[PDB]
Design a protein around this ligand. Sequence first.
Ligand SMILES: CCCCCCCCCCCCO[C@@H]1O[C@H](CO)[C@@H](O[C@H]2O[C@H](CO)[C@@H](O)[C@H](O)[C@H]2O)[C@H](O)[C@H]1O
Ligand code: NI
Lengths: 46, 50, 89, 50, 149, 50
Amino acid sequence: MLELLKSLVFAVIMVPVVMAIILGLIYGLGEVFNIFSGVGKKDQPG
Amino acid sequence: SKLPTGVGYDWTGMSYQERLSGNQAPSLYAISLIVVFLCLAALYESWSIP
Amino acid sequence: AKDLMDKEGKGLIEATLDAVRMRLRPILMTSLAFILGVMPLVISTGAGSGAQNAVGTGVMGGMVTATVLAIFFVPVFFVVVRRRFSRKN
Amino acid sequence: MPNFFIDRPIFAWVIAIIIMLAGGLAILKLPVAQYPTIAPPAVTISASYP
Amino acid sequence: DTAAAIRAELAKMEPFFPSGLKIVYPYDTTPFVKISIHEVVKTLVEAIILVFLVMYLFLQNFRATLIPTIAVPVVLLGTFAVLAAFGFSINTLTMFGMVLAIGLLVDDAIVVVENVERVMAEEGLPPKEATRKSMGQIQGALVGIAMVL
Amino acid sequence: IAKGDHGEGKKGFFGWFNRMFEKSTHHYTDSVGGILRSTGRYLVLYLIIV
Ligand SMILES: CCCCCCCCCCCCO[C@@H]1O[C@H](CO)[C@@H](O[C@H]2O[C@H](CO)[C@@H](O)[C@H](O)[C@H]2O)[C@H](O)[C@H]1O
Ligand code: NI
């Protein structure tokens, strides 16, 4: 039961933290994927 | 329990059996009563109608 | 994206953009739920922690790169499998 | 398939609960042990000439 | 179970022991396994918590968050039922496997609960009309994701 | 709930969240636009990580 209070505190604190990171990662990746936007493919399959 | 030390006891056969369980009826009729409370409503689709 | 293709009147690019934009959130909801579902196993120590660490740190790294990275690449796979090899008729 | 349940809300509860009792019973009835046996079974003959 | 029998077999002995003679347990596998399952059960509960937090934090409603929460236990104990019926035990491995199972399974629920939410957020049709519509665009995906997995 | 509302007009932290998320979404989408014009390098970057 007491370990449950620990669970609640870690939970509440962590949910935002991890959340931010995964958004941070796409936000960042989005910017670098923005910079490096390529020319297309090759004609061999056609 | 009021006998010489070194003497003990054990039940066998029928006595032994009645130990495992003699009366589960009030438990399994209870689950019978809940699985019945709800399984009827699985057609009457109704609250408390069963 | 496919449903928007056939069951609605759409070509690939704009369809993809709408699918992926409508679908973006759920992916995070799941992955956040999941990555956090497994949290204890990765954080865990003692009490014979050998297993749950080995399982959790396995699924976690693979959960980030399958989310932060895969939402970018899926669109390209679905386009390239059409845009470069489809039924023109 | 789903729609059937959308109109029939309770009957789903019945499915779920039946599964709740099935699983909740399935702990109480199932063997608990660290290891599902994982070795070639082996018998062992043993002698002793003093 | 064998050890459980052994403490039984032995529990009947002490009253007829001679003076000064006492039992002691220098090497014992069991509490490892009692603890091994204690730890996983507690990871499971706290996982159900954490799911319910990411659910609230995303659907921002007490009511909404009940739905996917209720659906998880039903799945996970449901598994005991079926793997009992295939002669598999509630072991270290199996029980440990189902935490991963919880993880995967949670979203099977939420993808659809969400999708209904998002569908009702624009055409603004009641939960019935919306959830039905939702089943129409996805339900087919769910069987196949399950098949391919 | 309302038709068309995505919960921006809501009291407290929750609105902030919904706005910055919806923001994160536009960003991501406008970014996939860019990626999707450039199919090729992506196919072969995909090769480098493979
Ligand atoms: C009882 C044990 C056997 C279980 C397995 C039985 C298989 C059928 C499961 C019943 C559910 C109905 O299964 C139905 O299958 C067809 C096959 O394309 C799908 O029909 C299709 O609809 C559109 C296009 O047609 C797409 O979303 C998708 O291509 C596909 O799902 C339905 O979306 C799916 O709901
Ligand atoms: Ni834009």
